[PDB]
Q: What sequence folds into this?
């Protein structure tokens, strides 16, 4: 058996039968041995490749294989790889390397220190020391990617290694499983449940790891038992809670003073499956309101260690929430009132207000749509206006690395055969991942992409107000036709400027067997 | 005192002092405080994508020779530029890349848009990288960054600055920083010359192999004079990124093949290989055999000590390529050989197919294009065609990505053109390559940069079909890129584009494009040999 | 309140009141603010300091603070720090750095990239970006060091930072706790207990994490229930099991072929709290014997991912073993017979055979002595001849980094007020940590150090036989008088070459209230 034959038998064994790639000189020898039950998904650009892989991974929860070209290809993906770290995405990224004997002379398409290139992002990286060790290195890469705290891994393989004889002890590799402890001490539970039934006025703050661990329902049950309001942790990348449940209050602001002012009056903040906290704008003050204690539950030891306040429990979010939800006593307090009806959304301007666009999307879109959002200035509008209740209904770049949305939408859709993925991309964001449109065309991936085109980097105009920087060079991106870009990559696109035309183009796009792009002209509030 | 200056005011006074008045950027939360203090004599060039930004900066740098400033956003923006940065390393391009970082007190908690270990992110590419330990040290860190970028062996440097540092009071002793110069020894021992000239006048049949650093050091003329004096054939070192010699000079023989056995077979018969301004060697395809032909000794002259150390054969001299070549050219004795005959006429260029053969397209480009065009090439399968068919005779006439990192060509062309007020830049980009830097077309449109971009569209990754023959890998997934309209992409970014499939229509579209005051794209349908 | 005042209030809060150090220019400002309830332990050499800290940490289980000097001081400790990684030792190593404004100009005693210097060893390293962040960086360092998988952390602090005003939000830091899930799913248990009661002829292989988690008793109960033989995993750094219990069989050989041949006949290898496996000598072949499946239980996800065979469970070793021990059914199989008598130990030679010296040590030493071993060629002798029956009775350098033994003995003794620590150091090993004798003298630490002096690097003569390298330069270390070295550092020393004189010197040394060193002349088998 060759290193290639054993590696492929192993990827199949682990469910990595979808490969996202942009190929090169040094990866043809890997790709040549590829079996017929595997599918290769080509992207024209490594950032798109990797972000497509990321979206595919987020929807499935499964590890996902990426194959990139040398240093130039791996480098082009570093920006996207940041999002994978904070989204706890088990991408397994393999890179082709030049013939093993020639790397030292730095011949053309040598990756010099391949283990260093992708640090400090990836949890783990290896250039195996010999062809023999390539299969076990890939086994270790996969187990490592799926180990709490989940995350991306990188393996650089010299192209001549694939042809080498595989080591005898490789039937051994296939058989390997690695399990995580899926709970925490019985003693440590009774402390959590005492503190919860103790609290006079508690609040749940929920992060992406609740959505990742498919614990939306157990979060709901725990909010019902405590009659507790529920906020989403700041800078959210996923939606961990039904947005029209009585307990839902929205997203905490990502300012230190602003977040503590919002939670004023609560004696216990229980934060589940989020860092404490993913602040953004620098607005200094108190982490907590007076007379408040914070309990913190996370898969990520890094998150628990680096928090500046609180009592953390490092444990699986799924299990913990399931246990607490099924064992806390219903409280005395009255069940919470139903939420106000959705605020009314008028539009005065040449185009649509984001608030109105999202209300039109709510009315038109399937009950079980998946929304891949990368529309930086429209957050307040989205949350005040969307009705999400399925697991896995919202994805946003977890480190605000732009060029996630368009590609992640395509990848999410490929993973989601019976759920409609709708991309809501700004005109700025779309340019970082535009070539993923070609992949949707080629592989007939029926995504809907909505470009919110306000002619500007809106969120950066928002910041030049808070930072008193004023009229800075390069806030404006005028003169982009996204219909021309879509047709350039073989995707059918229409431009739209009124509610009636949008409702039409959207109803149409949801019916389509093919990728569709709608360019909406949107208005930016210049206060 | 009332002579109180901010870190921003001193940094800007310094960038002006050093000629870095052109800034390439894609902005973010953490860079607005830098950009806000930017003066009026400075120009910001926005790119929609950091790889495009940085490749534009690279092109601008290659034409001028000067250090060039880039400003990127945090970890996500810096990471998007790692691919492009590889080309900067092998092209010895003095890019100074600054990145915004989150407020200094908040980086440890890893708040949103924290770069965690900013110094590690860009290793091992950049020669040098710093996150200064305080606001006070930001000006000197940037001074050091610039001197370091321009120091043999030239290359890219990275500085991550927390955004709150710009507003901090600058250190007292900063008039001192401006006054700073750093000079490199621009020559080598008199004794060491007489060894070079003895070995050269010794050789019964010597050959010059020339690399990018001859073009970088503006030594094209002195290389010519040296080839005239030795009546020596001149080859370009393999996997060239620049053209260091006139391609229609008597001595010109073309590009050495980038295989070990193939290169040594080509130089068979020569007793002295003098390699100037190149690694030994930038091989690509693994074709094993002898590094040198029988009876041959290799002299190797390079600014780069790394290149001299890592070479697997040869006697190297680490010295400035410019000076060395100037000295040798002016002091070697005319040899007892006949001056070399003029080159044959250009081979004839017929095209059988639905489109143009690259050899015919390049012959049409030769006939249409000004004497002094600059060509930015990123067309991987068309190399033999280019060299057999182009008449390059001026410094700085050819750029190709120095680590074959694709997404250099389109953006580097735009940047090269911005730097090149009196010379037409012509991009020759494949349909594959163009997608890695497509957004640089927007920058050309916005800033009214009169580049001509020729997409050679053969519907495929041609050079990878070339490789699946040599590597016996066969029908591999993802060799084909069908269903892309570059005219639609150009018009999408506000560049005027036409598609063309015959010599008559190409000659027309090209004559027109060269007259334009605006970026123009010609999509040529080309033929790929499947037999 | 200054960064120094808050840092000290925090170290006290966390029980880090014992500080091991070698001081310099850049650490005086930290040390000056040290309170009276704290003790500083000076070592003359950073390797010794850090190995002393390691020994102190191993006996207590607690995180332990080290303070080193700049790049030259930190560099001198890199070797010792390797042992801390593989011994899962929560050392918190702080280093002084030059004044923050002057680091860039690389003035004298600048650490250039302090975060890079100690990678890839330490789990985690920071140079805080400002004085304000120094207390939280140290809080994060501590939590990180104690988080499964435990290990060393490094923090470089510019000396001017200690004097800076501390941030408002510092009462917050003190209050912080981080707990680990101290168990694993009820479902995942029933799989373990089925597989164990299933097996016709199972074997326990035990590693250092059993001793670290104070699970010696529960390992015993589980071996009694399965009437199972117990081996220690190869290259052991701790003793996880009573050596005179019926089930005890010794240490597995650290060769691939040799280990699988030893376990031939077993259908289930359960490995608890060790890597799979810590091989040394390259003796190639089959990882497992035919018809064998390996279950692997570890706190370390790194250990579980990189293993080349086995079904791994990443979980707390203490809990797991306690659960299994209390819930597996007693088996049909006959209770195991009492062990063979200790083999006879005669000596023909100018000195003692190691086997005879260890039998003299067995007879003379308290039931509950702690042995710190760094005697590379004497392993077979130690295990065939010692009666260890208590938690924390054996320590050996976990990456065979020499210069652990002498210092770890001193540190172990300082931590161990009512148990006698006995160091068994070779003449080779002793030179790497000799200066720790000074620390024992200064702080009146009643360690007993036995130098086994065979005039040679014995284990390297052992290897030049297996590697057919022959008479290699530098196998011999003649002309060293350890009595002169002891007295040089203010420790009482005697040299000894017969059983009768050893029994005398040893009886005397156990009576001492002061460090004592015995140099025994030993014989090396050149066969
Ligand atoms: C790779 C990368 N480059 C730059 C940024 C900075 N950035 C964040 S918000 C923003 C504006 C994006 O514009 P658009 O998508 O149009 O959103 P809008 O604010 O207009 O709703 C930019 C450029 C980033 N986060 N990531
Ligand atoms: C960033 C990057 N990804 C992948 C490669 C591998 N590669 C080498 S040539 C090539 C095909 C591009 O060819 P194209 O521009 O279509 O020109 P042609 O081969 O048709 O002449 C690719 C993808 C690379 N060099 N750089
Ligand atoms: C820091 C370090 N350097 C070198 C070695 C290699 N080494 C391992 S065993 C050994 C010899 C030590 O001999 P000694 O302690 O006298 O014991 P003996 O072999 O005679 O039992 C050496 C040099 C090592 N393990 N650690
Ligand atoms: Na916008
Ligand atoms: Na092509
Ligand atoms: Na010895």
A:
């Amino acid at each position: 058996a060759t290193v290639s034959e054993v590696t492929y038998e192993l990827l199949r064994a682990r469910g990595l039968t979808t490969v996202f790639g942009n190929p090169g000189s040094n990866e043809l020898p890997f790709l040549s041995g590829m079996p017929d039950d595997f599918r290769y998904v080509l992207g024209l650009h490594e950032g798109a490749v990797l972000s497509m892989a990321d979206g595919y991974s987020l929807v499935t929860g499964e590890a996902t294989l990426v194959n990139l070209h040398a240093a130039s290809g791996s480098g082009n993906a570093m920006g996207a790889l940041t999002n994978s770290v904070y989204s706890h995405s088990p991408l397994v990224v393999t890179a082709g390397q030049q013939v093993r004997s020639t790397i030292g002379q730095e011949v053309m398409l040598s990756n010099v220190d391949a283990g260093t290139l992708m640090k400090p992002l990836v949890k783990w990286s290896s250039e195996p020391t010999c062809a023999e060790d390539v299969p076990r290195t890939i086994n270790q890469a996969i187990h490592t990617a799926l180990l709490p705290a989940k995350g991306p891994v990188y393996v650089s393989v010299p192209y001549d290694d694939w042809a080498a004889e595989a080591p005898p002890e490789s039937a051994g590799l296939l058989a390997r499983e690695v399990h995580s402890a899926a709970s925490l001490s019985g003693d440590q539970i009774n402390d959590l449940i005492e503190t919860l039934e103790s609290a006079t006025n508690p609040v749940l703050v929920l992060g992406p790891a609740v959505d990742a661990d498919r614990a939306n329902a157990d979060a709901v049950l725990l909010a019902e038992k405590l009659r507790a309001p529920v906020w989403i942790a700041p800078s959210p990348s996923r939606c961990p809670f039904p947005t029209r449940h009585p307990s839902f209050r929205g997203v905490l602001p990502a300012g230190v003073a602003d977040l503590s002012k919002t939670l004023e009056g609560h004696d216990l903040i229980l934060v589940v499956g989020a860092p404490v906290f993913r602040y953004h704008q620098y607005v200094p003050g108190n982490y907590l309101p007076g007379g408040a204690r914070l309990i913190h539950v996370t898969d990520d030891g890094g998150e628990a260690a680096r928090a500046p306040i609180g009592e953390a429990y490092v444990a699986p979010v799924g299990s913990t929430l399931e246990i607490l939800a099924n064992m806390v006593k219903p409280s005395d307090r009255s069940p919470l009132p139903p939420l106000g009806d959705f605020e009314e959304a008028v539009s005065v301007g040449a185009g649509l207000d984001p608030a109105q666009l999202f209300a039109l999307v709510r009315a038109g879109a399937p009950d079980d749509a998946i929304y891949v959002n990368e529309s930086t200035s429209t957050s307040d509008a989205f949350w005040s206006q969307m009705d999400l209740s399925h697991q896995g209904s919202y994805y946003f770049p977890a480190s605000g690395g732009l060029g996630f949305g368009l590609p992640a939408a395509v990848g999410a859709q490929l993973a989601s055969p019976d759920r409609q993925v709708i991309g809501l991309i700004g005109d700025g964001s779309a340019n970082y991942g535009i070539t993923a449109l070609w992949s949707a065309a080629q592989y007939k991936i029926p995504v809907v992409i909505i470009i919110l085109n306000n002619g500007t980097y809106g969120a950066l105009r928002g910041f030049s107000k808070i930072l008193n920087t004023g009229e800075t060079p390069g806030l404006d991106v005028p003169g982009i036709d996204f219909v021309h870009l879509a047709e350039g990559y073989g995707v059918r696109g229409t431009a739209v400027a009124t509610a009636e035309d949008f409702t039409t183009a959207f109803k149409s796009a949801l019916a389509a067997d093919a990728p569709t792009l709608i360019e909406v002209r949107t208005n930016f509030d210049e206060s």
The radius of gyration of chain C is 24 Å.
